[PDB]
Amino acid sequence: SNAMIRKYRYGAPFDTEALTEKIETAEEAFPYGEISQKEGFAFTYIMDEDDIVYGLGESNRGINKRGYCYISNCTDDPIHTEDKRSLYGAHNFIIVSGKTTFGLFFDYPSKLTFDIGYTRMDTLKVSCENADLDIYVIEGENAYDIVKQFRRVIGRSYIPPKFAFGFGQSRWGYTTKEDFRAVAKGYRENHIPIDMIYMDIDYMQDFKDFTVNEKNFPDFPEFVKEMKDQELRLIPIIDAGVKVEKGYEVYEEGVKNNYFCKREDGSDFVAAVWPGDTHFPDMLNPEARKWFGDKYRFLIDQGIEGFWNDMNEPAIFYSSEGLAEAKEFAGEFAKDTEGKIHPWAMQAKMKDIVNSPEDYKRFYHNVNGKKIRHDKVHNLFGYNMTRAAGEAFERIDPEKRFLMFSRSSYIGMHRYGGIWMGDNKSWWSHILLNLKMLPSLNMCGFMYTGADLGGFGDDTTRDLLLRFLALGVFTPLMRDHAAEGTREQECYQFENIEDFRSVINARYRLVPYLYSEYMKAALNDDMYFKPLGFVYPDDKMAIRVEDQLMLGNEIMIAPVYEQNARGRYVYLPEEMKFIKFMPDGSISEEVLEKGVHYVDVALNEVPLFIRSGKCIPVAEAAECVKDIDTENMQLIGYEGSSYTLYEDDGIHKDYDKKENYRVLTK
Numbered sequence: 001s002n003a004m005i006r007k008y009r010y011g012a013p014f015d016t017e018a019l020t021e022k023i024e025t026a027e028e029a030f031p032y033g034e035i036s037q038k039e040g041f042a043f044t045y046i047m048d049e050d051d052i053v054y055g056l057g058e059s060n061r062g063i064n065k066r067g068y069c070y071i072s073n074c075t076d077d078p079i080h081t082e083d084k085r086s087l088y089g090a091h092n093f094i095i096v097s098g099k100t101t102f103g104l105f106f107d108y109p110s111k112l113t114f115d116i117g118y119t120r121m122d123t124l125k126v127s128c129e130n131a132d133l134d135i136y137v138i139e140g141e142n143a144y145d146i147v148k149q150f151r152r153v154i155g156r157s158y159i160p161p162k163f164a165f166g167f168g169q170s171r172w173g174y175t176t177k178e179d180f181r182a183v184a185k186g187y188r189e190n191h192i193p194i195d196m197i198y199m200d201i202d203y204m205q206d207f208k209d210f211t212v213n214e215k216n217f218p219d220f221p222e223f224v225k226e227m228k229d230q231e232l233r234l235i236p237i238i239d240a241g242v243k244v245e246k247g248y249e250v251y252e253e254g255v256k257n258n259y260f261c262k263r264e265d266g267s268d269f270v271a272a273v274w275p276g277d278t279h280f281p282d283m284l285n286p287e288a289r290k291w292f293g294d295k296y297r298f299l300i301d302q303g304i305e306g307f308w309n310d311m312n313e314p315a316i317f318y319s320s321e322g323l324a325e326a327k328e329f330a331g332e333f334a335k336d337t338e339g340k341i342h343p344w345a346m347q348a349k350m351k352d353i354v355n356s357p358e359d360y361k362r363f364y365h366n367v368n369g370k371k372i373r374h375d376k377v378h379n380l381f382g383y384n385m386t387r388a389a390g391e392a393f394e395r396i397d398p399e400k401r402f403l404m405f406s407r408s409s410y411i412g413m414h415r416y417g418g419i420w421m422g423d424n425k426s427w428w429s430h431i432l433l434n435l436k437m438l439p440s441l442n443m444c445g446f447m448y449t450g451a452d453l454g455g456f457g458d459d460t461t462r463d464l465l466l467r468f469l470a471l472g473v474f475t476p477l478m479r480d481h482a483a484e485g486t487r488e489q490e491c492y493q494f495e496n497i498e499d500f501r502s503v504i505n506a507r508y509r510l511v512p513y514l515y516s517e518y519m520k521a522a523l524n525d526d527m528y529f530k531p532l533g534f535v536y537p538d539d540k541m542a543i544r545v546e547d548q549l550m551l552g553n554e555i556m557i558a559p560v561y562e563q564n565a566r567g568r569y570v571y572l573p574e575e576m577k578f579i580k581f582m583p584d585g586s587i588s589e590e591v592l593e594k595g596v597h598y599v600d601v602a603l604n605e606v607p608l609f610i611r612s613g614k615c616i617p618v619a620e621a622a623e624c625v626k627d628i629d630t631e632n633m634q635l636i637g638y639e640g641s642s643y644t645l646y647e648d649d650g651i652h653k654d655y656d657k658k659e660n661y662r663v664l665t666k
């Protein structure tokens with residue numbers, strides 16, 4: 001059993017349940033590099049100059065992780081600049097790829113530092129404060145083999161309903177039925193395809209989880225049906241924090257049944273978020289999880305078929321303790337007459353109370369009769385919130401797939417939902433960041449993923465949105481979302497709307513292919529997106545390409561991510577057909593040989609490349625997933641080639657039937 005995977009145990013690790021496969025503890029010396037336990041735990045390895053380091057899922061910078069430091073420590077940080085070491089996810093799987101190749105999964109739920117050539121270029125050092133963890137060593141002939149081994153042992157990836165492969169629109173600010181009707185009309189009257197409209201926090205009654213604003217939605221299920229009859233599915237947000245409010249049932253039940261995270265003394269810990277004071281459900285306690293997940297029935301029973309889980313690092317604006325400290329400091333600053341307390345110090349204290357490391361030491365989880373301080377298991381919170389929801393969906397309607405994705409995650413959560421890449425910005429560099437995160441997420445089990453198209457924060461432009469959308473065409477989550485106070489970012493908010501229709505039409509024409517590749521990959525523990533080096537391992541040029549990706553076994557993508565550009569450079573490791581979805585609805589085709597090329601790609605054109613000896617099916621454009629005609633689709637690509645199409649009803653879980661597969665031959 002499990003010949004290629006060994007598990008090395010130190011101390012008394014918390015069981016994260018990341019793996020579904022039970023691996024016995026190995027008793028031999030750790031097989032690579034050196035282990036030191038003098039400062040807790042450290043693994044140190046000297047890399048060959050040509051080694052590439054893959055992995056880390058949702059983390060900053062590039063596909064090859066060499067040259068920086070990455071700290072797994074789930075953090076609400078809306079400014080994703082190159083210096084940042086921690087974002088929302090903790091995906092502790094890396095692969096050293098070169099003359100000596102192996103994979104490592106560090107199953108540890110707290111702050112874990114990956115110094116990948118930051119300190120010394122030749123040195124990989126992975127460290128944490130406590131030697132209480134399991135480290136899995138995965139052997140294999142190459143990096144792709146090692147990834148496939150890992151994907152097997154962590155269990156099958158979450159599978160969304162097919163409607164989730166349409167286009168979605170959200171904004172922090174949609175509040176009233178008028179707001180949502182205006183979005184529906186803006187897309188539908190302009191014949192821009194769309195399947196989902198996201199409901200952000202203003203839909204709740206005073207930011208209370210599992211409520212709907214009674215003034216704005218007096219007959220909510222009727223409104224849900226108004227939208228669904230037009231093939232628009234409302235996708236509401238749920239937050240980690242439950243508002244403290246007398247008479248609010250979720251709060252009352254959480255208090256009475258000890259379902260919230262508690263302070264040292266047993267009191268329910270207060271964290272301020274959108275509602276002001278909240279309590280956090282104890283996501284690591286199985287009974288609290290069951291209770292919290294069961295609450296989703298409130299929305300499911302009203303016609304809702306999907307959710308997004310947010311603020312689940314968990315994010316904390318301040319604690320009662322931190323607020324009191326900040327106010328005391330402010331009082332001193334206010335009455336200072338000697339000029340001893342400077343404004344910068346006041347500013348620093350205000351910043352310090354937000355997402356404070358000290359607050360994460362102030363509350364506990366109750367697991368199997370043991371109270372564990374939250375910081376010790378910090379990176380498991382979002383994972384378990386989404387597990388709570390996923391497991392509830394199985395109880396509520398076991399036959400049905402729900403759309404589900406989370407901001408914060410840890411390996412293991414990939415069984416229950418996808419992720420979105422959080423609060424990016426309307427920056428050109430964030431198109432590239434979106435692209436690079438994709439294969440790494442796939443290595444860690446997270447295939448239903450994507451970024452806020454157009455950029456969440458700051459102000460977008462028409463061309464940036466168009467280029468973001470052209471990458472989103474290929475990402476399973478394709479959602480335009482934006483922050484409050486930003487320039488309006490719906491496609492209909494710009495001149496020459498036909499260009500937006502053209503780009504989103506390309507998504508819908510590709511949905512049968514993209515869904516098929518997703519399903520084949522998920523059902524077989526394989527990757528939807530792959531780095532070029534996984535497909536062309538013997539090509540020294542290919543292995544270092546980071547701004548192109550392979551999708552499935554048929555195509556390569558290469559989005560434009562430079563402002564004012566009319567094209568871009570590409571490297572083709574084999575002959576391919578360069579394909580563009582054109583704004584008049586036609587599909588242009590050009591054979592390009594192996595090697596370096598500059599390709600022209602206008603703002604309203606969507607490019608891809610079809611590999612030698614392959615073809616893909618392309619449907620006529622439709623405006624919602626339900627209406628896509630998949631009978632006798634056009635086949636684009638090479639004569640003599642075939643394609644195996646996976647197609648099911650997109651709704652249920654009947655995955656293993658021969659009727660789901662059809663061979664198309666060009």
Ligand SMILES: OCC(CO)N[C@H]1C[C@](O)(CO)[C@@H](O)[C@H](O)[C@H]1O
Nearest residue numbers: 076078172200201310407422423483
């Ligand atoms: O992290 C907090 C904020 C940014 O201030 N962003 C989060 C909350 C939010 O702003 C309102 O619900 C939402 O729109 C974002 O998608 C989410 O990441």
Ligand SMILES: [Cl-]
Nearest residue numbers: 217218219220
């Ligand atoms: Cl209503």
Ligand SMILES: [Cl-]
Nearest residue numbers: 637638639640
């Ligand atoms: Cl041909």
Ligand SMILES: [K+]
Nearest residue numbers: 455456457458
């Ligand atoms: K924006």
